[PDB]
Enzyme design. Structure first.
Site, mmCIF file in Angstrom:
data_model
loop_
_atom_site.group_PDB
_atom_site.id
_atom_site.type_symbol
_atom_site.label_atom_id
_atom_site.label_comp_id
_atom_site.label_asym_id
_atom_site.label_seq_id
_atom_site.Cartn_x
_atom_site.Cartn_y
_atom_site.Cartn_z
ATOM 1 N N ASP A 149 32.755 54.573 32.472
ATOM 2 C CA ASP A 149 32.325 53.788 33.627
ATOM 3 C C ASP A 149 33.243 54.003 34.836
ATOM 4 O OD1 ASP A 149 30.832 51.917 35.184
ATOM 5 O OD2 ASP A 149 31.495 50.175 34.076
ATOM 6 N N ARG A 153 34.520 50.577 42.088
ATOM 7 C CA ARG A 153 34.669 49.170 41.685
ATOM 8 C C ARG A 153 35.650 48.995 40.514
ATOM 9 N NH1 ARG A 153 29.691 51.003 40.076
ATOM 10 N NH2 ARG A 153 29.590 51.346 37.817
ATOM 11 N N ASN A 154 35.938 50.070 39.788
ATOM 12 C CA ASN A 154 36.828 49.974 38.628
ATOM 13 C C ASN A 154 38.221 50.498 38.882
ATOM 14 O OD1 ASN A 154 35.429 48.598 36.635
ATOM 15 N ND2 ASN A 154 34.263 50.415 36.023
ATOM 16 N N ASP A 167 39.159 49.125 34.013
ATOM 17 C CA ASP A 167 37.793 49.017 33.520
ATOM 18 C C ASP A 167 37.388 47.544 33.368
ATOM 19 O OD1 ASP A 167 35.301 49.310 32.458
ATOM 20 O OD2 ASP A 167 35.908 50.400 30.664
HETATM 21 O O1 LIG Z 1 40.693 41.077 36.669
HETATM 22 C C1 LIG Z 1 41.341 42.137 36.789
HETATM 23 C C2 LIG Z 1 42.334 42.287 37.907
HETATM 24 C C3 LIG Z 1 41.861 41.994 39.206
HETATM 25 C C4 LIG Z 1 42.667 42.082 40.310
HETATM 26 C C5 LIG Z 1 43.986 42.484 40.095
HETATM 27 N N1 LIG Z 1 45.028 42.727 40.972
HETATM 28 N N2 LIG Z 1 46.127 43.167 40.311
HETATM 29 C C6 LIG Z 1 45.826 43.210 39.006
HETATM 30 C C7 LIG Z 1 44.483 42.786 38.799
HETATM 31 C C8 LIG Z 1 43.654 42.677 37.687
HETATM 32 N N3 LIG Z 1 41.088 43.194 35.897
HETATM 33 C C9 LIG Z 1 41.653 44.547 36.029
HETATM 34 C C10 LIG Z 1 42.558 44.897 34.840
HETATM 35 C C11 LIG Z 1 41.934 44.586 33.471
HETATM 36 C C12 LIG Z 1 41.161 43.235 33.441
HETATM 37 C C13 LIG Z 1 40.272 43.008 34.691
HETATM 38 C C14 LIG Z 1 40.988 45.700 33.006
HETATM 39 O O2 LIG Z 1 40.105 46.246 33.652
HETATM 40 N N4 LIG Z 1 41.309 46.017 31.659
HETATM 41 C C15 LIG Z 1 40.637 46.960 30.779
HETATM 42 C C16 LIG Z 1 41.054 48.382 30.919
HETATM 43 N N5 LIG Z 1 40.820 49.410 30.113
HETATM 44 C C17 LIG Z 1 41.444 50.476 30.811
HETATM 45 C C18 LIG Z 1 41.432 51.855 30.375
HETATM 46 C C19 LIG Z 1 40.380 52.757 30.992
HETATM 47 C C20 LIG Z 1 41.821 52.883 31.425
HETATM 48 N N6 LIG Z 1 42.010 50.040 31.958
HETATM 49 O O3 LIG Z 1 41.764 48.743 32.023
HETATM 50 C C21 LIG Z 1 42.507 45.278 31.185
HETATM 51 N N7 LIG Z 1 43.022 44.655 32.441
HETATM 52 C C22 LIG Z 1 44.193 43.761 32.407
HETATM 53 C C23 LIG Z 1 44.461 42.728 33.326
HETATM 54 C C24 LIG Z 1 45.629 41.980 33.227
HETATM 55 C C25 LIG Z 1 46.535 42.269 32.213
HETATM 56 C C26 LIG Z 1 46.282 43.280 31.294
HETATM 57 C C27 LIG Z 1 45.104 44.034 31.381
#
Ligand SMILES: O=C(c1ccc2[nH]ncc2c1)N1CCC2(CC1)C(=O)N(Cc1nc(C3CC3)no1)CN2c1ccccc1
Length: 294
Positions: A149, A153-154, A167
């Site tokens: 994905d 947006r990601n 993600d």
């Molecule tokens: O809501 C937010 C968000 C919003 C604004 C913010 N500003 N600064 C930070 C921040 C965070 N998210 C973004 C980070 C998030 C949760 C959703 C995520 O997409 N995760 C799953 C993931 N899998 C992968 C692998 C493909 C590489 N990468 O990420 C895991 N992940 C996460 C978030 C916090 C702690 C640990 C992991």
């Protein structure tokens, strides 16, 4: 070794998820904890913390534990990083760097291309944003990790236009129009998907390259428009069929205003019918980093 949960101090909510939340937190007395973090003296250390609701279903807790496993191996400057965990007790927590400018779609949408004649962004900086995404995907490819994905947006944005791939999953209201939903089927970002993903569900590093092409188109459009935005979901799926049939009737995203013909030709390579003819991320990064050099 669990991160000390007592040092995390809530500040505000960054994200409402289905089974948890992401919170912005300060770290109390940060110098004691530095080994994996870096904090400038006399400034507030801010982190993002994903927390599982302690009454969330068994299914939710299972999915959380797997995400911890996946995140644990990701170590690259352009992929989000696991700073620590609190999992020996509840609520289960993951901790990552705070990226102060939020997701890249929202961030770029507020900018215009700078007018040489004269918030703006220059063409070389757009290439720098694109090359960082290519470098992140290059790393994931060495892990044989398929993202599935990739889209602006990601991606997250920090200071000085630094980019990290994340993600979010597919539930945010803001981007509901980017996913195609059928009862009992996986939710699918069809406008970013290679034809073979749409027709066969085959997701590979090569379909990640296709998605990178669309993501690069987004960047060069300054996230001003949805891919194939004047076409219906049905027409986008039909278009996948035309790639398969290979009778010259398939269509492509058009060249953005900010995009030179040389760079557009790279995008078209990313959308090659044959997955093995699409460029590797190592070559995409090189092309983009050269061009952004000067
Ligand atoms: O809501 C937010 C968000 C919003 C604004 C913010 N500003 N600064 C930070 C921040 C965070 N998210 C973004 C980070 C998030 C949760 C959703 C995520 O997409 N995760 C799953 C993931 N899998 C992968 C692998 C493909 C590489 N990468 O990420 C895991 N992940 C996460 C978030 C916090 C702690 C640990 C992991």
């Amino acid at each position: 070794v669990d991160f000390p949960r007592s040092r995390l101090r809530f500040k505000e909510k960054l994200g409402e998820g289905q089974f948890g939340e992401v919170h912005l937190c300060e770290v109390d007395s940060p110098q004691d904890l530095v080994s994996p973090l870096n904090v400038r003296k006399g400034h507030p250390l801010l982190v993002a913390v994903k927390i599982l609701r302690p009454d969330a279903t068994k299914n939710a807790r299972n999915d959380f534990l797997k995400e911890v496993k996946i995140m644990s191996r990701l170590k690259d400057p352009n992929i989000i990083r696991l700073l620590g965990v609190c999992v020996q007790d509840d609520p289960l927590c993951m901790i990552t760097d705070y990226m102060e400018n939020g997701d890249l779609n929202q961030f770029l949408s507020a900018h215009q291309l700078e007018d040489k004649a004269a918030p703006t962004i220059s063409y070389p900086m757009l290439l720098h944003v694109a090359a960082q995404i290519a470098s992140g995907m290059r790393y994931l490819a060495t892990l044989n990790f398929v993202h599935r994905d990739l889209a602006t947006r990601n991606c997250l944005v920090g200071e000085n236009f630094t980019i990290k791939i994340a993600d979010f999953g597919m539930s945010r209201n803001l981007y509901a129009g980017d996913y195609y939903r059928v009862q009992g089927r996986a939710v699918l970002p069809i406008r970013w998907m290679a034809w073979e993903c749409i027709l066969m569900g085959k997701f590979t590093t090569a379909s990640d390259v296709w998605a990178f092409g669309v993501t690069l188109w987004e960047v060069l459009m300054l996230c001003r428009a949805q891919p194939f935005g004047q076409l219906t979901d049905e027409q986008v799926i039909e278009n996948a069929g035309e790639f398969f049939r290979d009778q010259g009737r398939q269509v492509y995203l058009s060249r953005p205003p900010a995009c030179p013909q040389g760079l557009y030709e790279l995008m078209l390579r990313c959308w090659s019918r044959e997955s093995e003819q699409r460029p590797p991320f190592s070559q995409l990064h090189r092309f983009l980093a050269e061009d952004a050099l000067n």
